Amino acid sequence: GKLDATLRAIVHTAAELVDARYGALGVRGYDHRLVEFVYEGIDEETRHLIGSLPEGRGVLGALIEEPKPIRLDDISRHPASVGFPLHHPPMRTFLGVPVRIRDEVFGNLYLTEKADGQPFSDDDEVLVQALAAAAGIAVDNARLFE
Amino acid sequence: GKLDATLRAIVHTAAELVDARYGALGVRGYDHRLVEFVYEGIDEETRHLIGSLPEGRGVLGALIEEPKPIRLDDISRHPASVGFPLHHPPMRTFLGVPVRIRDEVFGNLYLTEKADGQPFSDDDEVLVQALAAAAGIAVDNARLFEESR
Ligand code: HEM
């Protein structure tokens, strides 16, 4: 539509910008279930194989509690990592930022598997922060929340 | 402090993702002159020989005085077209969107010359809009202007 289409554009744009194989952005509602879930790097066939949508339970729920960008050379190092459900493709390098405006958080933007086992840089972080802010404006524009 | 590197990254990713040969991002000051001019797709002979920075005099200011994106098959069939100074590459397809945040317009981001003479698409314009809004965030964060502080 308009939000979905802009969210998809951001995820695609961020992955390209930071040169990541995969990207997602989830936006969650009042019940903490997703309203918007947009992902890059995986076709519809593997998507259906993965099955359930994420619960945002580990590193990603660290991202929503904190407001902090999370930038990791290996996500399994992080205390709150829970690992991946079967068929989900393996990923180690992780760059995730919150999607936000004012003191409101809507969800997150996250990228994995930077080309060759290269770590994400701070350059990369600032770009993903710029795009996650563009995503905050887009959600706030669409309204969606009280 | 990364502002310039950020904009150069944005312009580069824009041009490539939309298949344009050329792309540029200009931010102007309170005095209507460029503060930042980022461009992609040209050598140094050429850049030196274009000479003078653009004044934002035609289609580029159409984007200035009213937001909304401009997407054209042929630059010269916009009633604002001024043309190009000598040495500047000829450009026919155009895709332009204002760079901005809140009620502030800091500049414009633009692409020309989709490969194969193809025209810019809606999807092309959506992506660029996304990158331009991120560029406005980046200009805003940089506290370059008083309506940021
Ligand atoms: C294509 C880009 C994707 C990226 C960048 C991505 C990222 C991640 C990351 C970093 C984790 C780590 C969990 C942790 O250790 O805390 C994870 C787990 C998980 N992912 Fe993905 N993912 C993608 C695609 C998908 C898709 C398409 C689905 C499902 C339809 C999905 C569903 C899940 C589920 C159910 C988990 C278990 C954790 C949870 O519920 O939060 N992912 N993903």
Ligand code: HEM
């Ligand atoms: C490489 C990416 C570039 C793009 C996409 C681009 C785009 C354009 C476009 C579309 C116009 C026509 C405006 C109109 O006719 O209404 C134009 C004109 C012009 N360009 Fe470029 N340009 C690029 C590079 C440059 C560079 C590097 C310079 C100077 C160093 C320059 C200087 C000018 C000048 C002086 C004009 C005449 C209009 C004005 O003064 O605003 N251009 N350009």
